[PDB]
């Protein structure tokens, strides 16, 4: 359901941190359960993650926050 990554870069300047962030999130949403944060479209984890990103609510900050939190828990 996704054709480009432009707004993704717009939300994260590196364009590579983009990559790694997406990847971490993706491994989560494929192995670590933890259902996504957006109506899926039979799309794979990958696109799911990029879409979560351009919904401006997932990044490296949020990730490490939630990891530390769940780890405390």
């Amino acid at each position: 359901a996704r054709v480009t990554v432009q707004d993704a870069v717009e939300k994260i300047g590196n364009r590579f941190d983009l990559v790694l962030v997406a990847a971490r999130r993706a491994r989560q949403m494929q192995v670590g359960g933890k259902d996504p944060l957006v109506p899926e479209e039979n799309d794979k984890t990958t696109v799911i993650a990029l879409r979560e990103i351009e919904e401006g609510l997932i990044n490296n900050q949020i990730l490490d926050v939630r990891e530390r939190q769940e780890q405390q828990e």
């Binding site: 996704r2 054709v3 480009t4 990554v5 432009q6 993704a8 300047g13 590196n14 364009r15 590579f16 941190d17 983009l18 990559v19 790694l20 997406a22 990847a23 993706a26 491994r27 494929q30 039979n42 799309d43 794979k44 984890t45 990958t46 696109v47 993650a49 990029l50």
Partner: protein
């Protein structure tokens, strides 16, 4: 797991520690059974089992019994991997020279020993003898002797003597040599001696030695005592289909070595005679030599029938060694390849893929989803499922594909585009469908080209593709700013036909509200496609701060044009498409569309472009027929007239009015003129012939002849090609590069007569053949460049410095060639540029320069800008961001780590193909002759004169008597732009302070004569002239006149050979003309070998040239051109006849004019002047004794030596020189290449340096090491109180900077192996990775991108 790789020599005991036994029997296998022979190359109890966890005797076929060795056959039991890990050795019963250390040029052994390699050889292969501590004798230690010499010596000294011959000898030599007395004595020798080659040899020696001692090594180790053997697997005995075995060469080599060693063993115990044992040892040494490097020592030994068998060296080096064969690239699973086609129904973010092909590709994923849905318990069952190819399978396949990008590649993978990605859509057939646009990016027509596909297997990589490889994300080549989604032939023909007015057609000039209803008319056919028409339209201009204002209005346009308009995205202005939409047009169209509305709309717009294009193109049907190429009626007439002209010139020749040479030349020129006339005729009668009524009477208009359409479109072909279809095809050139005196009369429509076609044949075959060799040499260039930059990545954010280079736009006096805008764009300020209004901040000092600031500059018309460049960033082990500027394809600044190295490399490379092979380079020579004749000022400004001592001529003009005049061009502010030299006594067409415009000539003179200009007026006598004796009278036929040639000493008559003739201006009767202001008359003494025309008794005006001096000149740069010129630049080949420059600045003077390179002394204004320099007198000069010149200034004339440039002018200077030259080449062929790339190349081109003073350092003085290392060192060292070091950057050609790099494995993997590995091995050069090629080899991540994040985290952790 690990880190930096270490390398060193081989201690015999270290080897023993490696091995697990020693072969003794040369036999390979049983080949009666297939069991390996005991204690041989394949022996288990040395090496190990055949099949996993199975003894040879057949004892323990059981994991439970692992670990323990046998006792019957006595063999360990494990995985067969051990059969690969282990290694074996051989106790050679005699020492052996290691041929690498023996023959590398230089021989490490030799230099260590100070001995001619030839004689060291003569030692090794046993035809000599060498002393070993002979004692109180008449003989020297290193001394060597022959047979009879040795025998007489033996009889001269029976026992106390000591010498030997061969391996043992060399070994004892080295073991005897102490490595500290050497340091002492040789440093003393360098201190004392003076000879230059001595210095160089001795310094190489001392380098070798001090390094060797710094390591923990031992020289004798250079001699092998226990030669290891390769593990067996890697030399496997291939069982061919038959009772034979196509043995690997390694096997046979080891076999020979073993037989040899065994005969040697069996001999010694039997005390066989010395001649025999010598022959034995000799064969042994040669065999070991073969083992290591067959083919390096004399005749190689062959293998099967006649071809030299492969060796270990071979297995490393060469195009097909391990490096170039399996590590810098390799074969790869999960892939495929096919032929390609078009399928224009594909939103370019996708591409075709063959169904069968896919189903075979993703089989893993298939099995996965299969047993997820649970349709097969075991994997095997699913394998059967896929093979049966049942229904459910395909649905699952679609499922797994739906969003999983794949990679496409073409073969000639030239540049970054060369691999892209898509999302497949599954198609019938068996080929790959591929979007049309992306063709040109692939440089890939559909002539049958094969493309390959890869599939990322992992999730991260799926992201990789979708982020950095999905053609969407590449509209711009990182090479240069042009778009790369340019439409092409079909689609553009379409649009052309789709927007072009005729004068009169169905639906003429009606009115239409909605482009919708326009398309309605067209589909109805109730109104012609292209027709003049008034229509309402609506457009959107977004002047507001990110907000779109809608307006709407009526337009006088064409129906189809609107119909196109219904697809323009909401943004652009309407006027973009009012015109005819040529290729260039639609190019700008798409491009502006991008730059104004971002990316997503751009791509969707591109695909809509293609759709609508193909559509109306077909709907039109632009065919081509023979009648569609009109032969110009006047063609027959014109060529007949030309024939008559040829006859006229032929009559002139036959009547002897001209020689065959100018005959040839006249004929060719007149044919050329005729050709051009014909071209004009045909182009006219095509482009305009369409002439039709209008509801009036007539009118001419642009045509519709499909061929002219296809051209003016810009689809393919142009005036040129349509010419070679209709008019004559001009002239053709024989292989001589000459050009035949009879052109092609006819064209392709008519038939060529044989001889013509035959000529044009070789005419074209020349280039058609050229392209091959061209491709080859180009590729070599590319590779070399990549391995000079494979280890440079932007790492830190901001160096934070205040250095850089200047930029001025190049001008030919009139218009500018390089718009400073288009040279600076994308790069970043160095200082703050002051307003033209002096002392006013126009732009900040450390900020980007994008298009709007460029426009501001243009508005303010800035002369030059100081700007940062990668050349000199202060980064360590990398390059700071802001110094690199806009990564193209991404308007914003570079991202933290996108490794510019490789992209720059490619970008330089790719145009390779597109150069020419072999011509003469011209660039600097053009302006060269220009400035010779007369001065050319650049721009508008006033005039300033330095050292102006002159005199007004009779005409009122001015000519200069001071030999030191400088011309300064004044701006509208008060500084100076140009400071030109001034030849002596030039005809000044101007004067000081005169406000003149840009691009004008101000002076004039004979470019090749030292004038003898007067000083006063009055009559002329032969004052001091010696008649006949010194002078000579020379009557010249062609000029029908004589003159007075001034003969120099060796040429004038000997009588008064020292009597000097002169000339003094006199009054009306011969008295002295005292110079106004001085007391001496104006006598001028005449230098020899000159020419004088005027004779005695002539009135002359103040400021007249008297005599002339023939000034020799030669500009033979005739080894220069194109691709090889690029090569030689990045190579820094000292050109054939360099031009010398000023060592230091100051006053100059002559010296003792010894024949040959006479002398030239220099002296600083105050500093010491210990310097002189000898210069070949036969070479011309550009200076005189009284001159005072700047350092690094031109002295001789000719090509400009990069090395001396560096060591004199400056880094900025040299990088500017390189970039100007290379840009000149590529422009002379016209391929836009942003400078940044060449810049970074140069940066690597100077990554080493040498020393002058260590101060408090950790460095030997006469030493070479990278710039970065010393800079980081002395940085902290100066941070402490102690004093730093003095260095000197030294430029290296790429094919060198490669070699001496910090790392080695790269070099090892570049252009040669043995040299590098050996020098390392003696260096003990412990080596980190810190580099792409390195990690590629070891296969961990790459510190480039994503991997740059990885390495940052890791280095942070430790």
């Amino acid at each position: 797991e690990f880190d930096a790789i270490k390398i060193a020599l081989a201690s015999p005991d270290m080897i023993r520690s490696w091995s697990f036994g020693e072969v003794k029997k040369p036999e390979t296998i049983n080949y009666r059974t297939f069991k390996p022979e005991r204690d041989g190359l394949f022996c288990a109890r040395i090496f190990g089992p055949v099949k996993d966890y199975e003894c040879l005797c057949g004892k323990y076929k059981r994991l439970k019994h692992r670990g323990v060795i046998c006792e019957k056959c006595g063999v360990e039991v494990t995985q067969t991997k051990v059969r690969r890990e282990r290694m074996g050795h051989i106790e050679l019963a005699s020492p052996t020279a290691h041929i690498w250390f023996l023959k590398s040029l230089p021989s490490r052994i030799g230099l260590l020993l100070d001995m001619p390699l030839r004689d060291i050889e003569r030692v090794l292969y046993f035809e000599s003898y060498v002393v070993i501590e002979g004692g109180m004798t008449n003989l020297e230690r290193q001394q060597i002797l022959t047979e009879e010499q040795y025998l007489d010596a033996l009889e001269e000294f029976g026992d106390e003597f000591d010498a030997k011959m061969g391996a043992e000898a060399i070994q004892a030599l080295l073991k005897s040599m102490d490595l500290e007395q050497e340091c002492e004595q040789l440093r003393e020798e360098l201190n004392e001696t003076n000879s230059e080659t001595k210095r160089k040899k001795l310094t190489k020696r001392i380098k070798l030695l001090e390094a060797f001692v710094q390591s923990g090594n031992k020289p004798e180790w250079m001699i092998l005592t226990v030669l290891p053997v390769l593990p067996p697997d890697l030399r496997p005995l291939v069982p061919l289909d038959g009772g034979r075995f196509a043995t690997s060469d390694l096997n046979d080599l080891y076999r020979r070595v073993i037989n040899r060693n065994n005969r040697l063993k069996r001999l010694l115990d039997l005390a066989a005679p010395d001649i025999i044992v010598r022959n034995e040892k000799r064969m042994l040494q040669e065999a070991v030599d073969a083992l290591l490097d067959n083919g390096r020592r004399g005749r190689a030994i062959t293998g099967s029938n006649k071809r030299p068998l492969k060796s270990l060296a071979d297995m490393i080096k060469g195009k097909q060694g391990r490096f170039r064969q399996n590590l810098l690239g390799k074969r790869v699973d999960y892939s495929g390849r096919s032929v390609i086609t078009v399928g224009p129904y594909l939103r370019l973010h996708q591409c075709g893929l063959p169904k069968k092909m896919a189903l075979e590709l993703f089989k893993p994923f298939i099995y996965g989803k299969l047993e997820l849905r649970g349709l097969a318990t075991t994997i095997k069952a699913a394998k059967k499922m896929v093979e049966r190819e049942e229904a459910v399978v395909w649905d699952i396949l679609d499922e797994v594909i739906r969003e999983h990008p794949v990679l496409l590649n073409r073969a000639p993978t030239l540049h970054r585009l060369g691999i892209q990605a898509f999302e497949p859509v599954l198609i019938e057939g068996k080929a790959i469908q591929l979007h049309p646009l992306v063709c040109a990016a692939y440089n890939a027509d559909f002539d049958g080209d094969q493309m390959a596909v890869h599939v990322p297997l992992t999730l991260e990589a799926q992201l990789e593709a979708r982020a950095l490889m999905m053609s969407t994300n590449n509209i711009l080549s990182p090479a240069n700013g042009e778009p790369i989604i340019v439409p092409s032939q079909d689609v553009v023909l379409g649009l052309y036909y789709m927007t072009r007015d005729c004068v009169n057609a169905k639906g003429e000039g009606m009115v239409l509200t909605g482009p919708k209803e326009a398309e309605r008319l067209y589909r109805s056919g109730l109104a012609s496609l292209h027709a003049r028409v008034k229509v309402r339209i609506t457009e959107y201009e977004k002047d507001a701060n990110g907000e779109l204002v809608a307006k709407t209005s009526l337009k006088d346009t064409t129906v189809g044009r609107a119909i196109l308009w219904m697809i323009v995205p909401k943004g652009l202005p309407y006027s973009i498409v009012n015109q005819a939409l040529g290729k260039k047009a639609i190019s700008k169209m798409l491009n502006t569309c991008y730059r104004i509305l971002g990316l997503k709309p751009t791509v969707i717009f591109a695909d809509q472009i293609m759709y609508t294009g193909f559509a109306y193109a077909a709907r039109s049907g632009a065919s081509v027929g023979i009648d569609d190429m009109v032969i110009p009626e006047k063609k027959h007439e014109i060529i007949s007239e030309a024939e008559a002209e040829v006859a006229e010139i032929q009559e002139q020749f036959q009547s002897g009015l001209v020689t065959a040479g100018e005959r040839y030349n006249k004929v060719i020129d007149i044919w050329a003129a005729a050709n051009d006339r014909v071209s004009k005729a045909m182009m006219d009668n095509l482009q305009t012939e369409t002439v039709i009524n209008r509801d009036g009477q007539e009118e001419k208009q642009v045509s519709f002849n499909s061929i002219y359409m296809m051209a003016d479109s810009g689809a393919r072909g142009s005036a040129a090609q349509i010419r070679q279809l209709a008019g004559m095809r001009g002239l053709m050139a024989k292989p001589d590069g000459s050009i035949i005196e009879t052109p092609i009369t006819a064209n392709f429509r008519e038939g060529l007569n044989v001889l013509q076609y035959f000529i044009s044949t070789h005419g074209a075959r020349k280039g058609l053949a050229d392209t091959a060799l061209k491709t080859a040499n180009s590729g070599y260039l590319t590779r070399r460049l990549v391995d000079v930059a494979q280890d440079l990545v932007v790492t830190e954010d901001d160096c934070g410095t205040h250095e850089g280079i200047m930029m001025t736009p190049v001008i030919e006096g009139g218009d500018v060639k390089e718009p400073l805008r288009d040279r600076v764009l994308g790069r970043v300020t160095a200082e703050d540029v002051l307003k033209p209004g002096t002392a006013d901040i126009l732009v900040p000092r450390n900020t980007l320069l994008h298009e709007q600031w460029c426009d501001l500059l243009e508005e303010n018309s800035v002369d030059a800008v100081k700007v940062r460049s990668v050349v000199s960033c202060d980064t360590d082990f990398g390059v700071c961001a802001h110094c690199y500027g806009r990564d193209l394809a991404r308007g914003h600044i570079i991202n933290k780590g996108e490794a510019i190295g490789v992209i720059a490399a490619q970008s330089i490379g790719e145009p390779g193909t597109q150069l020419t092979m072999r011509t003469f380079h011209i660039g600097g020579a053009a302006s060269r002759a220009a400035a010779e004749s007369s001065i050319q000022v650049k721009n508008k400004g006033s005039i300033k004169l330095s050292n102006v001592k002159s005199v007004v001529n009779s005409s009122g003009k001015l000519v200069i008597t001071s030999r030191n005049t400088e011309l300064k061009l004044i701006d509208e502010f008060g500084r100076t732009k140009e400071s030109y030299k001034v030849p002596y006594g030039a005809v000044l067409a101007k004067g000081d302070g005169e406000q003149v415009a840009g691009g004008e000539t101000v002076a004039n003179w004979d470019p090749h004569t030292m004038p003898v200009i007067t000083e006063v007026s009055g009559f002329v006598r032969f004052t001091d002239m010696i008649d006949g004796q010194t002078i000579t009278r020379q009557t010249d036929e062609l000029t029908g006149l004589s003159s007075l040639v001034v003969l120099d000493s060796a040429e004038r008559t000997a009588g008064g050979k020292d009597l000097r003739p002169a000339l003094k201006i006199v009054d009306a009767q011969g008295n002295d003309v005292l110079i106004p202001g001085t007391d001496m008359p104006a006598q001028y003494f005449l230098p020899g070998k000159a020419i004088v025309q005027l004779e005695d008794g002539v009135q002359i005006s103040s400021g007249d040239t008297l005599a002339r001096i023939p000034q020799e000149s030669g500009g033979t740069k005739d080894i220069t051109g194109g691709l090889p010129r690029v090569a030689d630049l990045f190579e820094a080949r000292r050109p054939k006849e360099p031009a010398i420059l000023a060592e230091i600045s100051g006053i100059v003077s002559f010296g003792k004019e010894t024949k040959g390179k006479r002398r030239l002394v220099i002296t600083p204004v105050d500093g010491s002047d210990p310097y002189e320099e000898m210069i070949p007198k036969w070479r011309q000069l550009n200076v005189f004794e009284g001159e005072r010149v700047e350092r690094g200034d031109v002295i001789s004339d000719g090509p400009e030596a990069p090395h001396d440039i560096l060591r004199l002018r400056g880094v900025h200077a040299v990088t500017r020189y390189i970039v100007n030259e290379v840009q000149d080449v590529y422009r002379l062929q016209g391929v836009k290449i942003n400078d940044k790339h060449i810049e970074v190349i140069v940066r690597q081109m100077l990554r080493k340096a040498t020393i002058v003073n260590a101060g408090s350092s950790d460095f030997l003085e006469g030493e070479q090491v990278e710039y970065s290392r010393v800079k980081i060192a002395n940085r902290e060292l100066e941070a402490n109180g102690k004093v730093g070091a003095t260095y000197s950057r030294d430029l290296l050609g790429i094919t060198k900077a490669s070699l001496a790099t910090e790392s080695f494995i790269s070099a090892a993997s570049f252009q040669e192996t043995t040299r590098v590995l050996t020098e390392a091995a003696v260096a003990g050069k412990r080596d980190e990775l810190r580099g792409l090629k390195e990690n590629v080899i070891v296969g961990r991540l790459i510190p480039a991108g994503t991997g740059y994040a990885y390495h940052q985290d890791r280095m942070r952790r430790r």
